[PDB]
Amino acid sequence: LLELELDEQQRKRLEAFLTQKQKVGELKDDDFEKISELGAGVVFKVSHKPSGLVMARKLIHLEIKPAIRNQIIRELQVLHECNSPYIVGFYGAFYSDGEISICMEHMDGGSLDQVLKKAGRIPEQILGKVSIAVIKGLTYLREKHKIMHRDVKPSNILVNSRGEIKLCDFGVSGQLIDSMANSFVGTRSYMSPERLQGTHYSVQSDIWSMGLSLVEMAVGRYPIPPPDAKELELMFGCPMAIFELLDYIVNEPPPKLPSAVFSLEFQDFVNKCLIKNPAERADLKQLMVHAFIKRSDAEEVDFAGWLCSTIGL
Amino acid sequence: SIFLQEWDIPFEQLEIGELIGKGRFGQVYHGRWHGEVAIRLIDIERDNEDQLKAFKREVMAYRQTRHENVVLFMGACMSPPHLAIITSLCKGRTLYSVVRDAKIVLDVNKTRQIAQEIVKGMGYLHAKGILHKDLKSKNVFYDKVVITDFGLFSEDKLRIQNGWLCHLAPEIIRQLSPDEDKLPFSKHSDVFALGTIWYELHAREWPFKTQPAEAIIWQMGTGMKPNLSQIGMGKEISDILLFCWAFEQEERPTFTKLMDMLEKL
Ligand SMILES: Nc1ncnc2c1ncn2[C@@H]1O[C@H](COP(=O)(O)OP(=O)(O)OP(=O)(O)O)[C@@H](O)[C@H]1O
Ligand SMILES: Nc1ncnc2c1ncn2[C@@H]1O[C@H](COP(=O)(O)OP(=O)(O)OP(=O)(O)O)[C@@H](O)[C@H]1O
Ligand SMILES: [Cl-]
Ligand SMILES: [Mg+2]
Ligand SMILES: [Mg+2]
Hints:
CATH topology of the largest domain in chain B: Transferase(Phosphotransferase), domain 1
Helix content of chain A: 25-40%
Helix content of chain B: 25-40%
Largest sheet of chain A: 5 strands, antiparallel
Number of domains of chain B: 2
Oligomer: heterodimer
Strand order of the largest sheet of chain A: 2-3-5-7-6
Order of helices and strands of chain B: EEEHEEEHHEEHHHHH
Largest interface: A-B, 22 and 24 residues
CATH superfamily of the largest domain in chain A: Transferase(Phosphotransferase) domain 1
Number of strands of chain A: 9
Bound molecules: adenosine-5'-triphosphate, chloride ion, magnesium ion
Radius of gyration of chain B: 19 Å
Number of domains of chain A: 2
Distance between the termini of chain B: 49 Å
CATH class of the largest domain in chain A: Mainly Alpha
Structural class of chain B: alpha+beta
Strand content of chain B: 5-15%
CATH class of the largest domain in chain B: Mainly Alpha
């Protein structure tokens, strides 16, 4: 019926999300008016005419028979009770002659993936807030829904102008992932070393992801393979085979934050996430109370401030 | 630049029917080359006017092939814009679908028989010196047993589909992100792919039934062939399974030696 521990101001924001959600009944494809494209891997910044609103919408080709969609939407409905300051609240789900359309909150700031491109490298002071939000987010899921993200990427950490940080693209629909298996791989991985080998992916799997992603955030480059000698030498300011990348992840030592440039506290943080052994790796507790996390939580940061001072808006 | 007249089979009127082709390469329609055939429309990609050996020498060679275990190659035709390949419509069920059909008996001998055919066909294509490359389970039909869709390799950051990944031998599974053809496709590439179909026959599901893409890639990459003995299992079978999957493409059996083993029980 509610939740435990909520910020006074966030309690305001989240409350509005609900009142504005009761305004929308069904989900007519016509009610939505396509506006601008966003991303793909597809999302559009459309607008709902009836509720006179602008919500973010994702949808991907799926020629699944009517028999299937009904169950997918059923599991997908679970998303409703999944409301948190650290989660991109959604609205509903529907078909479209041959595709599923997920409707959710619009984070105008885009995923940290985009932001990391229009900033080159991300300040540690900020990654702290990010780390916190992420940890609380993942914590919220597991505790309140037994659900784990399963897919943690910088491209899935949405951040709006409110200086808010929320997660998205987290696997909640079981039956959907069946048809949603057999898909894009790419050249940058986030599979925890244990997974590549077979071990069940605990919530600690997402931790490795977070850890890995964090590193990419600071150095402004996908950590693996680690920079050469003249590469990293010229980075401070202000071409492989898929199997080889993976094999490296499994046998070679993980990425490390360049010393000197970052606090030793923070280094230890990412280090505690990138422990290649699941059991030996930090749990969502150790991290929540880690020297680094403790600091950044009190560290006064004009997030949204500098935020709109890099990507504008 | 090829026309239907250059083909054995007499053609005058070819009429398309209702689409039935999802697939990667082009769409497949239940058409009528006078008779009842299956038409695949692989609309040509722009430019690339330097692919003679690719078809001026390849596809035309699919003429003069004719086996009881291979789909009939009715013929194709490359226009300036589009491309279309005709082929005998198989009036049966794909091996994929039947090997998973709501409970069908299929013994171990009924299994051996299935494998007998697949290798007879692949052997034929071997002698003709033509690589199948993509020998999936979903590319075998049951009228008897018929192979199909051989030699079909003529899109931004690598899109890996279904169980296709678990048919690629080690040599191949080390693949670039861009790069989809011109991999280490050997004649062993094919014998390997067969192995996985065999596992499929006995396990009624294909290997790594649950692992992600990256997992298969790394696992099959390090040559981590899945279990063999699982109640019920059976020796003999277990053995041949490894041979087909041998990590060194040299250590793998040739279709003609594999057909021999296949007949020993
Ligand atoms: N609700 C949303 N609000 C704002 N931007 C979004 C939203 N959802 C997605 N995006 C944008 O879309 C991009 C990612 O799109 P998409 O989810 O299709 O692929 P991905 O997340 O990179 O890959 P995957 O879907 O496999 O995780 C991100 O850069 C993000 O900025
Ligand atoms: N020669 C054929 N005879 C009968 N049916 C065919 C033939 N070729 C294709 N089909 C039908 O087309 C459908 C899929 O087309 P296609 O062969 O392009 O892909 P596929 O066999 O499913 O393999 P993949 O989808 O992995 O490419 C199958 O359901 C099959 O029944
Ligand atoms: Cl522990
Ligand atoms: Mg996303
Ligand atoms: Mg096919």
